[PDB]
Specification:
part of a larger assembly, 5 chains, A mainly alpha (118), B mainly alpha (114), C mainly alpha (77), D alpha+beta (186), E alpha+beta (209), A: 118 residues, mainly alpha, C: 77 residues, globular, binds iron/sulfur cluster, transit peptide (chain E), oxidoreductase (chain E), translocase (chain E)
């Protein structure tokens, strides 16, 4: 077993597969509640399922690390947890809807303060 | 000529007064402490008098939002005087005692230059 | 109860107050317009009561009170 | 050497991966170090030793220096080899001066030549950046090498053209040397 | 064959470009526009309400994972009805890329706070509040940072004189330092450095209404 995570605070965590699996399940359900025509949904399943499908083939934690890339398991679980909070907040945010506000004319125009031909 | 816009704190003019008068409470209650803490000439009655005039400084504020900000400034300055971050110079600033009231009637202006 | 104490203390505030008209200073004297005191005067007056009674009053009391009798009601409270 | 504690790839060096051994010779070493302050003794003897190095204090103002030919110090308005003022009031020096410490007013001398009347520098606003001399098209103004120009009164620092010309006259030889050193190189 | 002219990282332009469309189609309600500035950085123009959702989306989602919030740069531009613009320039260590989020607001309406998203921002909101007066809603403590105590006005605005309105000295009558109306030994001499000849045609009609 690796002695240290190389980072302060980030401690070595056992049963990573169980934790990663459990995290992937919850986020999948969290996106399950989403509407079926949300781009955020469309991609999270394929990404998460790709991860949650890679979780199994590599019993060795180091083997899984290489297979999944993207960093070490210790951070990787945190990545998953972050996204759990994202989905719960995302459902609460309803960002799949259309534009709340149209920018006023000449808002995002650079350079500023130049007369124009109508 | 109305606009349907976000709030800041106060949703109605009466809430605005409620907030504005809350500030007036903190400032009135604070004055004695500053008279003690800050070794400056000013006395309680004068400090109280200035506090009155300095609210009167802007009586005809109308917008709910503008009056909200004025209170936001006051709550800040309250805390800066409540705790002693400020300095005797900073607190006296409200009196402007370095410059004599400049001439105002036309001749005194005329005879003293633009 | 203690209605002498409440009335006595309440009266002495406005009795011994600047910015005020002694006559017409009824217990039914509306601070705002009957008494001619500004709202700011009104705020400082209720505070002087918080001085003479050492009592934490809510801001909602401000409108719920109008008259020295009103604060007498809130003082014997 | 003790083994590491985190395996390191290249492009990095962990400065604490070395393990604190538990071998008896290793613990007794550390214990003896604490019981008799060996590490302090090493540092102690270092400072004793380093008395025996000669101090590097320059005996100022007798001994002094070194500087380099590009040193940016007192300002000076140079003059041609004939003695004529080099400045022509092109006013670039003012236009570039980051601190806006330069003020110029020029007219025609009776000969009809384009020359300054007032030429002022405030060395309480100048930053001795040297943008003025890098810009001047005739090397009229230069950051002369003098740097001991210290005054008891603030007013004495605001140089006008008369003061600047005097410095140019005073320092002309040295300024000539530097420019001969750097003109083809600057 | 132009050694003077640099050549950007094209593949970096590729990734940022496709990723930018990803963000636009994942946050439809908020992202108003996504553009790729020629300096290879990526800008994300949002409406004022989506500030936190965009930041929260970025820091959290796998593909973004933009954890560090470098700064909150404030920009002032009169002639834009709600002028005060804000810039949230973020970094992503996981993918080694930078992103910029931008929003607008006027001198009156408040603005969302990033204190609840990145703890790093806390001081920055205090800084913009001091320097422009852009309020921040839900900010824990909006105390001024830089300007001195009892300073009136927010100097970084472009409708504020460079030298300020007042300046300090010391009184002997009062053994104290007093602020006085401005008085300058030499009035700051501007220079009118305006180009008469348009030196850039490419930006002339491009970006028109
Ligand atoms: S740049 Fe040189 S020549 Fe031009 S005004 Fe300045 S000192 Fe004179
Ligand atoms: S050295 Fe720099 S700051 Fe000083 S006068 Fe020359 S250009 Fe101005």
């Amino acid at each position: 077993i690796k002695a240290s995570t190389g980072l302060t605070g980030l401690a070595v965590s056992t049963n990573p597969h169980h934790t990663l699996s459990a995290l992937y399940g919850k986020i999948l359900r969290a996106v399950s509640k989403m509407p079926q025509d949300a781009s955020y949904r469309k991609y999270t399943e394929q990404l998460v399922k790709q991860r949650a499908d890679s979780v199994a083939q590599h019993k060795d934690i180091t083997a899984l690390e290489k297979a999944v890339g993207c960093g070490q398991v210790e951070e990787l679980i945190v990545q998953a947890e972050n996204e759990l909070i994202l989905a719960r907040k995302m459902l609460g945010w309803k960002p799949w809807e259309k534009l709340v506000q149209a920018a006023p004319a000449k808002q995002w125009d650079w350079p500023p303060a130049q007369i124009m031909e109508p | 000529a109305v606009q349907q816009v976000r709030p800041i704190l106060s949703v109605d003019r009466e809430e605005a007064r409620k907030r504005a008068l809350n500030l007036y409470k903190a400032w009135y209650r604070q004055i004695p402490y500053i008279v003690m803490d800050y070794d400056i000439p000013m006395t309680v009655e004068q400090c109280r008098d200035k506090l009155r005039e300095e609210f009167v400084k802007h009586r005809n504020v109308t917008d709910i939002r503008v009056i909200d900000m004025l209170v936001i400034k006051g709550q800040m300055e309250l805390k800066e005087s409540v705790e002693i971050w400020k300095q005797k110079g900073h607190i006296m600033r409200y009196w402007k005692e370095s410059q004599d009231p400049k001439p105002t009637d036309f001749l005194s202006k005329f005879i003293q230059g633009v | 109860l203690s209605l002498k104490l409440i009335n006595e203390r309440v009266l002495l505030v406005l009795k011994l107050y600047d910015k005020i008209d002694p006559s017409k200073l009824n217990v039914e004297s509306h601070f705002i317009n009957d008494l001619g005191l500004d709202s700011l005067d009104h705020v400082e007056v209720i505070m002087a009561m918080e001085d003479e009674f050492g009592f934490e009053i809510p801001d909602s009391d401000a409108e719920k009170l109008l008259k020295p009798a009103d604060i007498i009601k809130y003082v014997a409270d | 050497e003790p083994k590491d504690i985190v395996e390191v790839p290249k492009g990095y060096v962990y400065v604490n991966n070395k393990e604190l051994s538990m071998e008896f010779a290793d613990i007794t070493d550390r214990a003896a170090s604490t019981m008799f302050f060996g590490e302090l003794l090493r540092g102690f003897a270092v400072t004793l030793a380093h008395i025996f190095k000669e101090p590097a204090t320059i005996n100022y103002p007798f001994e002094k220096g070194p500087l380099s030919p590009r040193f940016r110090g007192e300002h000076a308005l140079r003059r041609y080899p004939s003695g004529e003022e080099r400045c022509i009031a092109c006013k670039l020096c003012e236009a570039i001066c980051p601190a806006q410490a330069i003020t110029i007013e020029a007219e025609e001398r009776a000969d009809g030549s384009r020359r300054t009347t007032r030429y002022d520098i405030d060395m309480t606003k100048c930053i001795y950046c040297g943008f003025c001399q890098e810009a001047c098209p005739v090397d009229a103004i230069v950051e002369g090498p003098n740097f001991e120009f210290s005054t008891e009164t603030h007013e004495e620092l605001l140089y006008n053209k008369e003061k600047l010309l005097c410095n140019g006259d005073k320092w002309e030889s040295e300024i000539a040397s530097n420019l001969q050193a750097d003109h083809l190189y600057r | 064959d132009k050694p003077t002219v640099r050549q950007p990282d094209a593949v970096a332009r590729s990734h940022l470009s496709d990723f930018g469309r990803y963000v636009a189609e994942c946050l439809p309600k908020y992202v108003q526009k996504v553009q790729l500035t020629a300096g290879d950085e990526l800008e994300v123009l949002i409406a004022p309400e989506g500030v936190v959702p965009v930041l929260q989306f970025l820091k959290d989602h796998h593909q973004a994972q933009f954890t560090n919030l470098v700064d909150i740069a404030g920009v002032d531009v009169p002639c834009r009805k709600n002028r005060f613009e804000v810039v949230y320039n973020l970094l992503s260590l996981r993918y080694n890329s930078r992103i910029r989020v931008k929003t607008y607001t006027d001198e009156l309406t408040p603005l969302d706070s990033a204190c609840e998203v990145h703890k790093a921002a806390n001081w920055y909101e205090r800084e913009i509040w001091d320097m422009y007066g852009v309020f921040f809603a839900n900010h824990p403590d909006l105390r001024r940072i830089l300007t001195d105590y009892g300073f009136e006005g927010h100097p970084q605005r472009r409708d504020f004189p460079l030298s300020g309105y007042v300046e300090l000295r010391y009184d002997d009558e009062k053994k104290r330092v007093v602020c006085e109306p401005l008085e300058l030994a030499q009035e700051f001499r501007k220079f009118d450095l305006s180009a008469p000849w348009e030196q850039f045609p490419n930006f002339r009609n491009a970006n028109p209404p």
